[PDB]
């Protein structure tokens, strides 16, 4: 059936803030995209300089 189709574990790839399947997301999600857009922002500052 299509109910046999199961996603395997990604625990060897996930971030530390979303490793737990019991706690909810959307609490640390803004911190994660803040870190990623901070990396993007400082790269864009460097290339603009």
């Amino acid at each position: 059936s299509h109910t046999d189709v199961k996603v395997p574990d990604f625990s060897d790839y996930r971030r530390a803030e979303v490793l737990d399947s019991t706690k909810s997301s959307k609490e640390s999600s803004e911190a994660r995209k803040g870190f990623s857009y901070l990396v993007t922002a400082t790269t864009t500052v460097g290339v603009a300089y």
Partner: protein, 446 residues
């Protein structure tokens, strides 16, 4: 004469009473000669531990195949003795057994429901027969691509949690399914404080309360281990599942974000957002003059076969998004247009669209609650989710609080710059990469 708010005020109130067991007995009375009486149980597929995944569905199968008091099809004959309709469903969070009947047979039907509550005989030959029937209807439900996409979206949106597993479970669980685990599931998930006996139509609340005190007294009241089963939260995962099978003629794609839940009131505002976008399929007769911009664009450019928008809510979680079936050669373009509409609701929601969505939501909320059966369903799910039956006047008061500013604030809260869950099935080569979709979930012009 009467206005809309006065007419909603004139709707009768749902009477709710309690038992010593913890049963919630609720009833809404109208002037109909028929009635719908059902039992709603807070036990879905979310309460299973991955080794009893098909347990509630298999109980729903064996629930109508005889009891200890009424062995076998004679039970069915009883439901056909009075001309009653016996229906049931199982969800990821709820289970319901409901009977439509007349009012004059209102005692015995309650007793019949009580039988299916607490005396369900599980014969082993019936286990093998219903195992074959479950395998047959899972291979039948594989043909319907919409349910496959729904299950794929739930599997990829809540990975590693008890909300990813399907209602019916995997096939191997159906093969090795014993009777002891069904008895354990019935013992630990069919207790009295997780049950609502709901009646709608030509009923009396005192007579129904007396019948529940007679038949539905002492259902379980005991956890049998002094271990209350609870529900941990389920982690939403922005991810993507793509089932590529080019032999199918059409492709189904669903894109969702994480929803707020049941008790969070902005649900109502999010309903208005869906009412702005709406639904469309090829059998409609509006042409290019449809009010929804997505529907008008899809008609004009011949993009999609059909689309719909959903706001599915579970206990402090949910999915919120769109699902469309279309040919391969349009898929990417449809995604683009859909994302544009979402960002429009995040940036430039106007007052006329908000008023139209509010009118559509009022029409949907009242037009759903016609007849005894959806009213009984509303009562049971309201006492199970909110803990109370929310009146339609309170829905009207909640709709009237919505203007364009809080609508675009809520849409910026939930839709804007968020990781979606994408489920695809069919010729989905032109379905864009997840980086493209995540880029399309925000605007550079804001």
């Amino acid at each position: 004469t009467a206005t809309f708010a006065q007419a909603l005020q004139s709707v009768p109130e749902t009477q709710v009473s309690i038992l010593d067991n913890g049963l919630r007995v609720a009833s809404e009375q109208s002037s109909h000669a028929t009635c719908t009486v059902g039992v709603w149980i807070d036990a879905g597929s979310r309460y299973e531990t991955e080794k009893n995944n098909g347990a509630g569905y298999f109980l729903e199968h064996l629930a109508f195949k005889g009891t200890k008091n009424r062995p076998g099809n004679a039970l069915e004959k009883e439901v056909e003795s009075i001309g009653a309709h016996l229906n049931a469903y199982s969800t990821r969070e709820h289970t319901a057994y409901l009977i439509k009947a007349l009012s004059k047979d209102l005692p015995k039907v309650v007793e019949l429901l009580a039988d299916i509550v607490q005396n369900s005989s599980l014969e082993d030959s019936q286990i093998e027969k219903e195992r074959d029937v479950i395998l047959r209807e899972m291979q039948e439900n594989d043909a319907s691509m919409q349910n496959v996409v729904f299950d794929y979206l739930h599997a990829t949106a809540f990975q590693g949690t008890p909300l990813a597993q399907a209602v019916e479970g995997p096939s191997e669980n159906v093969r090795r399914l014993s009777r002891t685990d069904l008895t354990d599931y019935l013992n630990r998930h069919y207790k009295a404080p997780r049950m609502v006996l709901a009646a709608a139509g030509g009923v009396e609340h005192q007579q129904l309360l007396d019948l529940a005190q007679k038949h539905l007294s002492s259902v379980s009241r005991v956890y049998e281990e002094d271990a209350v089963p609870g529900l941990t939260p389920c982690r939403f995962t922005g991810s993507e599942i793509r089932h590529r099978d080019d032999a199918l003629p059409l492709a189904h794609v669903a894109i969702a974000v994480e929803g707020p839940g049941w008790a969070n009131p902005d649900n109502v505002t999010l309903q208005v957002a869906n009412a702005i976008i709406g639904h469309y399929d090829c059998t409609y007769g509006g042409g290019v003059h449809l009010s929804s911009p997505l529907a008008s664009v899809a008609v004009a450019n011949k993009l999609c076969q059909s689309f719909q928008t959903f706001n599915i809510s579970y206990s402090d979680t949910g999915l919120l998004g769109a699902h469309f079936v279309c040919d391969a050669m349009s898929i990417d373009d449809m995604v683009f247009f859909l994302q544009g509409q979402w960002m429009r609701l995040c940036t430039s929601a106007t007052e006329s669209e908000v008023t139209r969505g509010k009118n559509i939501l009022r029409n949907a909320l009242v037009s759903h609650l016609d007849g005894t059966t959806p009213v009984c369903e509303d009562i049971g799910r309201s006492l199970l989710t909110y803990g109370r039956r929310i009146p339609l006047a309170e829905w009207e008061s909640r709709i009237q609080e919505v203007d364009a500013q809080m609508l675009r604030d809520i849409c910026s809260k939930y839709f804007y710059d968020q990781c979606p869950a994408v489920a695809g099935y069919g010729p989905i080569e032109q379905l864009p990469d997840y980086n493209r979709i995540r880029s399309g979930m925000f605007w550079l012009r804001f």
